[PDB]
Amino acid sequence: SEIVLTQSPATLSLSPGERATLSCRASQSISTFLAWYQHKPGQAPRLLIYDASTRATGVPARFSGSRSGTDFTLTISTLEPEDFAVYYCQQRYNWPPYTFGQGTKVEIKRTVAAPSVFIFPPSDEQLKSGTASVVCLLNNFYPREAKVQWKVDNALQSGNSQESVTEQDSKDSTYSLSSTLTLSKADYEKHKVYACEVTHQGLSSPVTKSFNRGE
Amino acid sequence: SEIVLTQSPATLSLSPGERATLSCRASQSISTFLAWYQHKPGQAPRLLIYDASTRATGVPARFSGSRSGTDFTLTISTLEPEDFAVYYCQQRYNWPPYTFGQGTKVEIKRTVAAPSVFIFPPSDEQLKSGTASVVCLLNNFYPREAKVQWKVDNALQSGNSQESVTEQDSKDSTYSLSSTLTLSKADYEKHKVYACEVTHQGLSSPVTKSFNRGE
Amino acid sequence: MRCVGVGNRDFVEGLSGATWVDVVLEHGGCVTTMAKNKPTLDIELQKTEATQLATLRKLCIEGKITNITTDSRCPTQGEAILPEEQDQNYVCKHTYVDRGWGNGCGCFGKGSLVTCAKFQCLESIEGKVVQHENLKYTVIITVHTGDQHQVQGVTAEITSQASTAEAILPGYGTLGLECSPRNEMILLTMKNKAWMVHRQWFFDLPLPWTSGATTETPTWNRRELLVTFKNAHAKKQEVVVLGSQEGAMHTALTGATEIQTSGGTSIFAGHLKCRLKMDKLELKGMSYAMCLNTFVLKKEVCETQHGTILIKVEYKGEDAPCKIPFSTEDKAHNGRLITANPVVTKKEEPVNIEAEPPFGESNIVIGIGDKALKINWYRKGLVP
Amino acid sequence: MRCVGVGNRDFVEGLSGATWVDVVLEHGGCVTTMAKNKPTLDIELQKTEATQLATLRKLCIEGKITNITTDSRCPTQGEAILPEEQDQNYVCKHTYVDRGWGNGCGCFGKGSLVTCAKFQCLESIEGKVVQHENLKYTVIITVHTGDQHQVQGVTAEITSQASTAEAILPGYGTLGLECSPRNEMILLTMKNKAWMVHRQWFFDLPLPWTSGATTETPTWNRRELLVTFKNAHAKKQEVVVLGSQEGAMHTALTGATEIQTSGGTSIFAGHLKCRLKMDKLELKGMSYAMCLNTFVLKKEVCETQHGTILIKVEYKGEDAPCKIPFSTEDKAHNGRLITANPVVTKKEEPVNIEAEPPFGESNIVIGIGDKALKINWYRKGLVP
Amino acid sequence: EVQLVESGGGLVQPGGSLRLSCSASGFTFSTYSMHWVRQAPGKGLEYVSAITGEGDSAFYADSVKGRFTISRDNSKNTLYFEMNSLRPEDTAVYYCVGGYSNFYYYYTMDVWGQGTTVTVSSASTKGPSVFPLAPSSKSGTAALGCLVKDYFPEPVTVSWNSGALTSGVHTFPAVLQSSGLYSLSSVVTVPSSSLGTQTYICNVNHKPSNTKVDKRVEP
Amino acid sequence: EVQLVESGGGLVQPGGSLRLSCSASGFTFSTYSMHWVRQAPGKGLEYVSAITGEGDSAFYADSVKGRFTISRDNSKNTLYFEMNSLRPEDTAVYYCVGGYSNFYYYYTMDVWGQGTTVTVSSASTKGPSVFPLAPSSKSGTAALGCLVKDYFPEPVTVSWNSGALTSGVHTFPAVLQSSGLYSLSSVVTVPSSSLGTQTYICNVNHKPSNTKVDKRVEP
Ligand SMILES: *[C@@H]1O[C@H](CO[C@@H]2O[C@@H](C)[C@@H](O)[C@@H](O)[C@@H]2O)[C@@H](O[C@@H]2O[C@H](CO)[C@@H](O[C@@H]3O[C@H](CO[C@H]4O[C@H](CO)[C@@H](O)[C@H](O)[C@@H]4O)[C@@H](O)[C@H](O)[C@@H]3O)[C@H](O)[C@H]2NC(C)=O)[C@H](O)[C@H]1NC(C)=O
Ligand SMILES: *[C@@H]1O[C@H](CO[C@@H]2O[C@@H](C)[C@@H](O)[C@@H](O)[C@@H]2O)[C@@H](O[C@@H]2O[C@H](CO)[C@@H](O[C@@H]3O[C@H](CO[C@H]4O[C@H](CO)[C@@H](O)[C@H](O)[C@@H]4O)[C@@H](O)[C@H](O)[C@@H]3O)[C@H](O)[C@H]2NC(C)=O)[C@H](O)[C@H]1NC(C)=O
C-alpha cells in the first residue's frame, strides 16, 4: 500500500506577478511530512519547503506552505521570472519509499496566438534511401494544447507519427511543435495527397496544409 | 448621395509592439483623398496622414497609408503605448461635407480576466426619498464584451437599467462596468429577490449576485 | 394619422422650398415627410421580398455510411491499403491492431489496419446569398391627414431594375417615387425555415460541405466530421455516423434572426434609400374659408414621443367645410403644423391636429375670435 | 495461454520467495503473475458493474410553456405586474410597448409590459454519481498453461463489502483473492444511454436544473434558458420554448466515453487493486520424469511484444507424460519459464512454452541429449 | 506655431442661441479655409460647416442648415459660429478646423482648436444626492463607496478619503438619465480584513451648484 | 558548502552493469542518510533506494530490488550504486540525495548531486542522416532548414549558418524512434523576400560518432 501523492493542476498558467497555488493530495494522512521541490531543467531539484510549512534555508518568503487534512498547498505570493519551472511534492511520512508527486508545471500565461503551419515533403535523398518522412510544423502558438491530424488521401493516419514540442520561448512565451510521419517509401508512393490539419484555439476553424506527391 | 466611409474593425485589440492595420472603405471612389486622424480623449483629433499615403509633418514613420480601390488601410508598424486611441478616416474627395468615418478603437490586448461581481441594494435614504437604485458592479475584467442581466423575482428586467464602463486601466489594461437599475419605491417593494447575472468570457458559466429585500 | 405615438418615427422636411425629399425607409419605423404647400405623408417599407437566391455552399447535417470495408496486414508486412482510400466520398482511418497466431499471423506484434466507409448525405442545409438584383420592395404611403380615427393608404413596388413608381393618392394627386435599391451575411436555410447569419460564422460551421452546384452526386469536404472511428482495445475498429445535427444547429441559431420563407420567396426587414417628388401633390381644401365659430377639445392634448403635440378638437359651427385657424404665441407666432392645412369637414366628426410647438412655454390658439380655444403648453427638451 | 501477443500485458512476480502477489487489474489489459514453485496465472478484470446510483442533479433538455399571461400598464402609471412573477416554475420578462390612444391609453409614450409563462419539463437527463459501495467487480483467472491452442478459466466476484473470494482452479488448487475496491466524474444518463463526463463540465451545462429528489413537481433553476422572449417592433412580446436539446447534447457528447446501461445496471472499465494468495496452488505434473526423446518445433519461435519468446514444440517419444528439459546458454544457464513446469501430456498434441531469454545472444536447448533441440536467439532492447 | 483657440461654450436652453468664437495665430488667416466639426457624447466626429478663406461662400451640412451660420472676421483673425434654435441634439464638443486652401474649401494639412463644449437642456442646475455603496461579508476583498445621483450639469469630482485612498477606485462615467439629470457611481474594492478599521468617506464636488458632500460608508 | 558531486554515467547494453559514484564534501558524511532518486525521460522523479548513515541497512524500491545495490564508503566519503541487469526501462538521470538523520532514513533538509545520465540500449553508435527542410512559396515568411535522423546516442548540436542565424530557429527535442535511434528537426522561419539571396546552411554535430555535417537547403 504505497502512499501516492496526486498533484494538481497538471499545468498552471499564470502571468508574472500573479499569485500561484499548487495542490498535492495524499493517498492517506501523512500528517505534515510533506515537502515541496522546485525543478528547473538542467539543474537538480531544489527543496523549497518541508514539514508542510517550514521554508528551507535561503528560499524567498514568497514560497508558502499550507496543509489541511490530506490536501497540501504550495503558494507563491508573486511569481518572479525565475519561478516558472516544475514543482514536485514528496512525502516523508513514515518509512521509504519517500514517494514523489507527478509534478505541476507552472508556465507563463499569454494572449492566444495561432500557430503558423507548414508542411515538408520527404526529401529525394531520404526517398532514395528507402523511407519517407513528412514533417508538419506548428510555429509560435499559445496555448500549448494543439491537435495535429495527419491525412493521407481519404484516410486519417494513426500510430505512424511522432511529435516534439519546444519549451516556452524566452521572448514571446510561445510554443512550437514538429510532427513527423514516417512511412516506408513503398507505402509512401501508393498514396497521393499528404496533409496535416491543425486544430488550435487561435484558429476559428482548423487549417490544413497539404501537397500532392512528386510535384 | 453623401459619401460614407465605413471603418473596420470596430475595436482592434493588440498587444504593444504588434503590427496594426485599420480599414476604411469608401461608399464610392474618392481616388486618394482620404486622411487618417488619431483621437486621444481630452485632446483634439490629430491628422496623421493625408492624400491616402502622405504623412503629415512630424508624425512617426510607424504610421503608414495604403489605398486599393475604395479600400484604404492605415498601418502602424509597431504599436507604442502612445498609439492606443481611436482612429478616424475623413474623405476630402470633391466638396464638403468632408465626412468622417465612425472610428476604430485600438486597445491593449490582455489575458482573459473574469470580473469581480458585486450587488448593492437601494439605500435607506434614497428609499425614503421615493426611488430605489440597485447597482451591479463588474470589477477589472477583460475583454470588455460582458452581459449584465437584471432579474427580479421570476422576471427578466428590461429597459430600466443603465450601464457605464471605465476606460482601460493604465496598470492592468482592464475594464470595469456599473449597471444601475432604478425603480419607483412603489414598484420596488412589490418584489422580493433582486439579482444581476453576469456572463463573461472569464466565467465558465454565468455568476449571479442577489439579495432579498429588507434583510 | 398612422405614425403618431410610434417610437420609430423620423421627421424629414423639404429644405429651401423644395418639391422633393430624401427618405431612408428602414423597416419597422416610418418617415413623416413635409414640404411647403404640400400634404404631409407617412411613408414606410411594408416588407422586403427575395426570390431565386444563389446557393453559395451546402452543408450536411445528417449523413449515412454504407459499403464499409476493412483491410489489415501483419506485423512484418507493412501498412494495409484499400482502393476505397482514393475513391471519393469515402472516409477512412488507419490503426494498428494486435496480431498473432490466433487471428492468423505468422509471428506477433501490432499490424496495420484500415477501415473505409462510403459517406453520403441524407439531409443538408444551404447558405444562400442575397442578390440585390432580385429584391422587391413594397412601400405604403398614407397621407398624414386629420381624417377621423382616435390614432387607407396606397402602396407601390420597387424592383431593382424597375426602380421608379407612381403612387396615386386619391384627392391629393400623384406622388412620384424614385428609390435606389441599396450585407456580408447569408440566408441559412434549413428544412423550410431560414435565418440570417454572419458569413464567416457560417463558413466556420463544423459540418461537411459541398458547393452550390446542382449535381446530385457531390463530393463532401470534411466528411470526417460526421464519422467517428473507435479502436478501444486494439482488437477491432468500428465506424459509425453521427446522426443529425439539426438540434445542434437550432441551438446554435437561437440568437440568429429568423426569416420567413414560404415557396422560395423570403421576407426581409430591409433598408431602402429613396426619395419622393410631390410636383403633382397639392393639398385638399385650399378653396375653403376660415372657420368663424369656436373650437373645444374632445380630449386632453397629448405630447408624442418626439415632442410634437396631438390635439383632438370638435367644431360646433355651421360653416360647413372650413380651414381651421391655428397659431402659437410666446406675442403672435404662426404655428408649425405637421397635419398640413387642417380643415373641418363636418361639424359632428372631430379632427386631429399634430403640431410642433416651440421649446419652452407657448400658447396654441385655435379658431378665431377672443373666446377661441387657447391651450397653454410647455415643451421640454432634456435628452437627445 | 490467454495473454501472449496482447499489447496491454503486465508481468508481476512474487519477490523474495513469496506466496502472495499484488496486481492492479485495469480493464482492457491482463496481468501475468508468477511465484516460485507455483503455476503462472493470467488475471484480468472482466467487467465492472454498478447499480442503484444516486442522482446528484437533473437537467431538463425538453421543456414546455403553458398558462401564458400578460399584463401591461400605461406610460403614466408605472410598471406592470403579475402575481405569476412570484409563482414558481414561472419565467417572465418585462419590456416596454408603445402605448397611445389606439390601444387604449390616455396619453402617449412607452408603457410597461410583462409576459409570464408557466415552465414545465417534458424530458430530462440525470447526472448520477458512482458509489464505491455498489460496485461489483468480476475477475477471470485462467492458468498460464501450455495446454493446446495456437494462442476455460474460472471467475470470481468482488463486492465492496464482501471483498474476498476463492477461485477453484481444477487440477491446481484454490487461489485466494483479496482485492480492495479502490473519480471526480459523473454518469450522464440520457434516454436509455449513458456517458462518463467531467463533472464541472456537467455542472456548467447551460440547461435548467433541479436536484435529485424524487418529487414529481420540482422547481427548475435557470428555466430561462429554454424560453426566448421577442419584442421586435415594440408592438407585442412573444414567448416560445426552445425545443429539445437532445441533439445538442449528443453532439457535445461525441468525445465522452459511452457507457452501457441496461436495466439500472451499468458497466464500467474499472481499475481494481487486488492481490492473490496461492498457498493452496501447487503445480501439475511434478510427479513426472524428465523427457528422454527429442523435440522439434512445429512453428518458428516468435518474440512477443514484451520480449518473451513463444515456442511450439512436438515431442515424438513415448514416455507418456514427461517434464520438458529446458535451459538457456550464454555456457549453461537455467531458463526463466513463464509457462511454469512445461510437461508433455501426449505425444500427438504439441505444447506451447513461453520463456524470457536473456538480453543479447542466447541459446535455448529443449530436451536432453546432444541431438536435442537448440534454438539460437538474440533478444534486443531498444525502447522502454 | 500655427494654432487656433476657441471660446464661447456653455449651457443653452432649447430653442436658445449661442455664438462660438475661434481665434487664430501663427498663419496668414485669410489664406486658410475654416470648418466646424462637432462630436456628440458617445458618438463620432460630424463635419457640419465650412467657409472659404475670404468668407465669400459657406457650406452647411443638412443637420445645421438654417440654424447655424458660420462667419469670419479676417481683420480680427477669428472664426465665428452663430448657433440659433438649439435642440438637445446639438449638445456636443465643437472643434474649429483650419487649413490652407487654393480652392474654395479643399485643404490637405490642418490644425484643430482645443474644442469647446455646449450643452442644450431644459434641466436646471441641481446639486447631487449622495447615497452609500454599502458593503457586506466575503471575509477576501469587498467593494463599497458612493453613488452621485440627479445632478446637472456636468461635472462632479469624487475623491476617496480626501485623496488618501486612490488605488482600487473606479469613478464611472456619468450616465444621463431620462430626467435630463446625471448619475454616476464611484466604487473601490478593499480587503474585508479592514472593513471595521478604516472609515471610508467620499468627497462629492458639484461646483456648478457649489455643493460639496462628504458621505461616510459602512455596513 | 554542503555538496555532492556524481560520476559514472554512460551507455550500457541491456542486461549489462554499471556502478555510479557520488562523492560528498562539506559535512560529516557519516551522519547523513543517502538516497537515490531517478528520473526517466519525459517522466517524474522516482525515489528508488536509501541507506542509513552507517550503511548498516538499505531500502530498495520494488522497481530496482535485487538488481541495484546501494553502498557507502564512509572513510572515503562516497556513496555507490551498483546497478546490475539493466533493462531499457532504467534509462534515466540519477540523483543522489543526502540529508542529516537521527532515525534510519528519515531526513528533513537535503542536498542533491548534479545528476548523472545512464542510457541502456542495444543500439550501436551511429551518425545521423541529414535531409533538407525545403521551403516553397508564400511571398511573407516561409520555413526551412534541416532534419537529423537515425542517430545514436544523444546528443547532436545543430547550428544555423555557423551561428550567424539564431533568431527564429527552433531545434526540436529529439524523439527516440522504435528503431532505438534518435530523430530531431531544426527549423527556422525567414522572409521569402530573401529566399534566393541568403544561402541557408545547417551544421549538424554528432560528436559521439564525430560526424559533422553541413547541409545547404534551397527550394
Ligand atoms: C453499396 O451498398 C448497396 C446496398 O445498399 C445497402 O442496403 C442495405 C440492406 C445495407 O446493406 C446498407 O449497407 C445499404 O443501404 C449496394 O447494392 C445496391 O443496392 C441494391 C442492392 O442492395 C441494388 O438495387 C438492385 O437493383 C435491381 C435493378 O437491376 C440492375 O440494374 C442495373 C443495370 O446495370 C444495375 O447496375 C443495378 O445495380 C441492378 O443490379 C433491382 O432488382 C433491385 O432494386 C435491386 O435491389 C443496387 O443496384 C445496388 N447498386 C449497385 C449494384 O451498384 C451497392 O452496390 C454498394 N455500392 C458499391 C458496391 O459500389
Ligand atoms: C394551465 O393550463 C391547463 C390547460 O392545459 C392546456 O391544454 C391545452 C389545450 C393548451 O391550452 C395548453 O396551454 C395546456 O396544455 C389548465 O387546465 C387544466 O387541464 C384540463 C383542462 O384544460 C383539466 O382537466 C379536467 O379535469 C376534469 C376532472 O374534474 C375536476 O377534478 C378536480 C376536482 O377538484 C379539479 O381540480 C380538476 O381541475 C377538474 O376540474 C376532467 O373532466 C377533464 O380531464 C378536464 O379536462 C385540468 O384539471 C386543468 N387543471 C386545473 C383546472 O387546475 C390549468 O388549470 C392551467 N393552470 C392553472 C390555471 O393554474
Side-chain angles (χ1 to χ4, degrees), chain B residues 80-130:
Chain B
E80 299 295 314
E82 309 103 22
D83 304 339
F84 289 100
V86 175
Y87 290 82
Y88 290 106
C89 53
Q90 170 181 46
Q91 60 94 10
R92 295 139 180 211
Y93 163 53
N94 183 345
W95 209 246
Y98 295 143
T99 49
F100 283 101
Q102 292 304 339
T104 280
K105 184 201 213 193
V106 169
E107 82 167 8
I108 291 165
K109 200 189 204 147
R110 192 206 182 285
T111 50
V112 187
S116 313
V117 192
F118 302 83
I119 182 148
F120 296 96
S123 76
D124 270 302
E125 305 81 305
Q126 185 214 76
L127 279 155
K128 191 86 201 262
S129 151

Side-chain angles (χ1 to χ4, degrees), chain A residues 33 37 39 44-45 47 88 90 92 95-98 100 118 120 123 126 137 139-140 162 164-166 176-178, chain F residues 37 39 45 47 59 95 103-110 112-113 131-132 134 143 149 170 172-173 175-176 187:
Chain A
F33 297 96
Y37 286 89
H39 202 202
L47 176 78
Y88 290 106
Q90 170 181 46
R92 295 139 180 211
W95 209 246
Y98 295 143
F100 283 101
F118 302 83
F120 296 96
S123 76
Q126 185 214 76
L137 182 119
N139 188 261
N140 297 15
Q162 264 168 335
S164 171
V165 187
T166 62
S176 320
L177 181 151
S178 98
Chain F
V37 161
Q39 207 204 0
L45 305 172
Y47 181 97
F59 153 95
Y95 303 101
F103 208 36
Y104 285 88
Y105 314 109
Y106 177 86
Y107 65 106
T108 46
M109 284 182 51
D110 65 350
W112 292 57
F131 308 125
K149 209 184 164 293
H170 297 299
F172 282 93
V175 60
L176 175 134
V187 173

